[PDB]
Every structure is written in C-alpha cells, then in structure tokens.
Amino acid sequence: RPTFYRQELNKTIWEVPERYQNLSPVGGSVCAAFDTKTGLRVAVKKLSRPFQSIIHAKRTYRELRLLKHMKHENVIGLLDVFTPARSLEEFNDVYLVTHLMGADLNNIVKCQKLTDDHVQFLIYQILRGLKYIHSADIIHRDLKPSNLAVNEDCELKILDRGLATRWYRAPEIMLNWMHYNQTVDIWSVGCIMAELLTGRTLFPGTDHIDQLKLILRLVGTPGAELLKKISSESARNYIQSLTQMPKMNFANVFIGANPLAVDLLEKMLVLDSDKRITAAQALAHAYFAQYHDPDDEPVADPYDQSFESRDLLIDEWKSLTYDEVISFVPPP
Ligand SMILES: Cn1nc(C(C)(C)C)cc1NC(=O)Nc1ccc(Cl)cc1
Ligand SMILES: CCCCCCCCO[C@@H]1O[C@H](CO)[C@@H](O)[C@H](O)[C@H]1O
Numbered sequence: 001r002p003t004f005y006r007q008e009l010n011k012t013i014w015e016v017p018e019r020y021q022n023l024s025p026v027g028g029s030v031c032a033a034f035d036t037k038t039g040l041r042v043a044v045k046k047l048s049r050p051f052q053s054i055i056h057a058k059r060t061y062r063e064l065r066l067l068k069h070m071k072h073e074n075v076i077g078l079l080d081v082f083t084p085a086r087s088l089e090e091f092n093d094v095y096l097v098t099h100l101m102g103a104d105l106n107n108i109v110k111c112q113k114l115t116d117d118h119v120q121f122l123i124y125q126i127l128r129g130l131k132y133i134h135s136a137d138i139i140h141r142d143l144k145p146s147n148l149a150v151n152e153d154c155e156l157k158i159l160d161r162g163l164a165t166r167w168y169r170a171p172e173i174m175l176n177w178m179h180y181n182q183t184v185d186i187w188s189v190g191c192i193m194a195e196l197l198t199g200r201t202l203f204p205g206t207d208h209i210d211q212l213k214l215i216l217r218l219v220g221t222p223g224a225e226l227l228k229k230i231s232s233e234s235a236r237n238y239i240q241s242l243t244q245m246p247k248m249n250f251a252n253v254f255i256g257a258n259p260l261a262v263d264l265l266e267k268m269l270v271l272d273s274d275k276r277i278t279a280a281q282a283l284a285h286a287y288f289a290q291y292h293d294p295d296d297e298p299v300a301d302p303y304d305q306s307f308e309s310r311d312l313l314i315d316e317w318k319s320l321t322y323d324e325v326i327s328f329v330p331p332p
Pocket of ligand 2: 172177181212226229272273
C-alpha cells in the first residue's frame with residue numbers, strides 16, 4: 001500500500017495516495033487531481049456513505065463491477081480504485097479514478113456552431129461506445145448530453161453521473177413499460193443528434209404528459225402494427241386519446257440537414273422499438289462513411305451480472321466490493 005494523506009474539501013474529508021496531487025473540487029463529490037505516476041490530470045470520486053443501506057451497497061458494487069469492466073475509448077473506464085482501509089473490518093470508503101474530460105456535451109451544445117462533420121464525429125462515437133455497452137448486455141436508459149464527456153478535440157466518452165433528464169427518454173421508459181430493449185438508448189441518440197443539428201431540444205417537455213404529447217406530434221400516434229403488440233387494458237385503450245396524429249416527415253423538420261442525417265434520424269426515432277436501428281447497424285449507415293472502421297468498433301468481454309438478481313445483506317455486498325477493490329488491475 002502507498003502512503004495516504006488527509007485533506008478537507010467543501011466539508012468533505014478525502015484520504016488519497018500521495019500520488020494524486022493538486023486536489024480541487026469539480027462536482028456527488030468529485031475532485032480534479034494531478035496523477036504524478038502518469039503525468040496526467042484525473043477526476044477522483046469519493047463515494048458518499050457507500051454501505052449505508054442495502055440499496056446503496058448494491059449500487060456501490062454495481063458501480064465498481066461496471067467501471068472495472070468498461071474498457072473502450074468512448075466509454076468511461078477506471079484508471080484506479082482505492083480505499084484508505086487496511087482491512088475489510090476498517091473498510092468504509094471507496095474512491096474511483098477516471099480521466100477528467102473538460103466539458104460535457106451540454107456545454108458544447110448551446111454556444112458553439114456545429115458543422116455536419118461535427119455531428120458525424122460526435123454521433124459516431126456515441127454509437128461506437130453504445131455497440132460496446134450493448135454487447136455486454138448493458139442498457140444505459142438515461143443517455144443525455146450531461147452523460148457525455150467531451151474533450152477539447154471533441155473526443156467523447158459515455159458515462160452515468162447519475163441521480164431535464166426526461167427530454168431524451170424513450171416513450172416506453174416514460175410509460176414505465178418494464179420490458180425495455182436496448183434501442184431505448186438509440187431513441188436517446190436520436191434526440192441528442194436532432195439537437196446538435198438544429199441547436200435546439202427536440203422534445204422540450206414541461207412535464208411527463210407534455211413530453212409525450214411532443215413525441216407523438218413528431219412521430220405520429222401508434223400504427224396498427226405497434227398497437228397489436230400492446231398487451232394491456234387502457235394502455236392501448238387511450239389510443240388516439242391525444243388525436244389520431246399523422247407522422248411528420250423529417251425532411252420537413254430538419255430543413256437543410258444532410259439528407260443522410262435525416263434518414264438516420266428516421267430510423268432512430270421510431271415509436272416501435274422493434275423497428276429502431278441498432279447501434280451496430282447505425283455504424284454501417286452511409287452517414288458515418290468518413291469515420292466507420294469495421295475493424296475498430298470493438299465489442300465487450302462477457303459481463304457476468306447474475307449479481308443483479310441477488311438479494312444480499314449490507315455486509316455481503318460490502319465484502320464483495322472489498323474483493324473487487326483488492327482485485328483491481330490498472331490499465332497499461
Ligand atoms: C453506472 N454507470 N453506468 C455507466 C455506463 C452505462 C456508461 C457503462 C457508467 C457508469 N458510472 C459512471 O459513469 N460513473 C462515474 C464515476 C465517476 C465519475 Cl467522476 C463520473 C461518473
Ligand atoms: C405513446 C405510445 C407508447 C408507444 C411506445 C411503444 C414503443 C416501445 O416498443 C415496444 O415495447 C417493447 C420494448 O419495451 C417491445 O418489446 C415491443 O415489441 C415494442 O413494440
């Protein structure tokens with residue numbers, strides 16, 4: 001074990017290896033640090049009360065398992081994870097180390113003037129990262145501009161901050177469908193993409209109902225084919241209950257957009273999530289011709305997430321998390 005030191009920042013104590021220097025608050029509780037081992041600047045996150053409830057303990061464990069697993073350019077990965085605790089008995093705090101990236105995409109959006117080439121490169125990187133995420137059988141479910149770190153050269157990493165967020169949510173997530181396929185995230189890529197083109201939010205709903213009213217205005221009310229898949233009572237029984245809305249043709253909404261951008265949007269923003277384009281399929285769309293490389297759009301190693309079914313005690317989830325701290329191997 002290295003030697004640690006204690007420092008107080010914004011009413012939060014922080015005990016970190018001497019390696020991590022220059023500490024200064026950024027945000028949960030995140031600091032910028034200077035990593036003297038690799039000469040680069042990092043974000044260090046100290047987890048708040050990680051083993052306080054069962055649910056906190058399980059989420060702490062999912063955090064670590066998940067970040068230990070993500071190893072892709074366009075997805076947040078773990079540079080390091082440490083605890084000041086010398087033993088399990090004494091184990092209480094968890095710090096995560098990741099790359100700091102300057103902005104999130106939210107900053108970059110409303111003040112900069114995005115070329116079609118900007119939208120290609122930014123959207124290409126989200127899909128690329130999503131292929132990877134989705135190949136591990138992970139659905140993000142809350143993809144938005146705040147959850148995309150962008151550096152100065154417009155390199156992009158997907159992440160989860162986590163806890164308006166509703167502006168990018170798939171219609172099915174917002175009616176609480178419970179059977180979600182991965183294309184929920186494709187819906188989110190559509191909303192983001194449209195906003196990078198127009199510079200404005202596609203569905204800036206004021207609340208839940210308004211959000212959905214705005215979605216249907218664009219995509220139209222459900223067709224016969226989609227309707228025939230709805231199991232439920234009055235889930236379907238309020239059919240045209242917000243008028244029998246005709247679907248907008250997107251060439252009319254995205255005037256002066258690359259017609260290939262328009263065509264991809266039509267394939268992302270389908271009501272019926274069985275008809276949505278996949279991440280891997282969207283990669284092969286002519287819109288990404290300048291960036292698409294078939295041999296450098298990698299998939300994930302098998303991700304064991306049996307643990308999610310498990311109902312364990314606070315102290316089992318704490319031990320499991322301890323094991324994960326102990327077993328961490330740093331990137332090259
Ligand atoms: C829970 N979670 N899920 C994902 C995805 C889906 C992108 C793999 C990523 C994460 N977790 C995070 O993104 N966590 C995280 C950790 C530290 C900082 Cl400074 C910022 C964010
Ligand atoms: C506003 C009316 C709600 C329309 C949302 C329906 C689109 C969601 O997609 C639907 O739901 C499931 C995915 O969760 C799929 O398995 C279904 O087959 C699919 O059609």
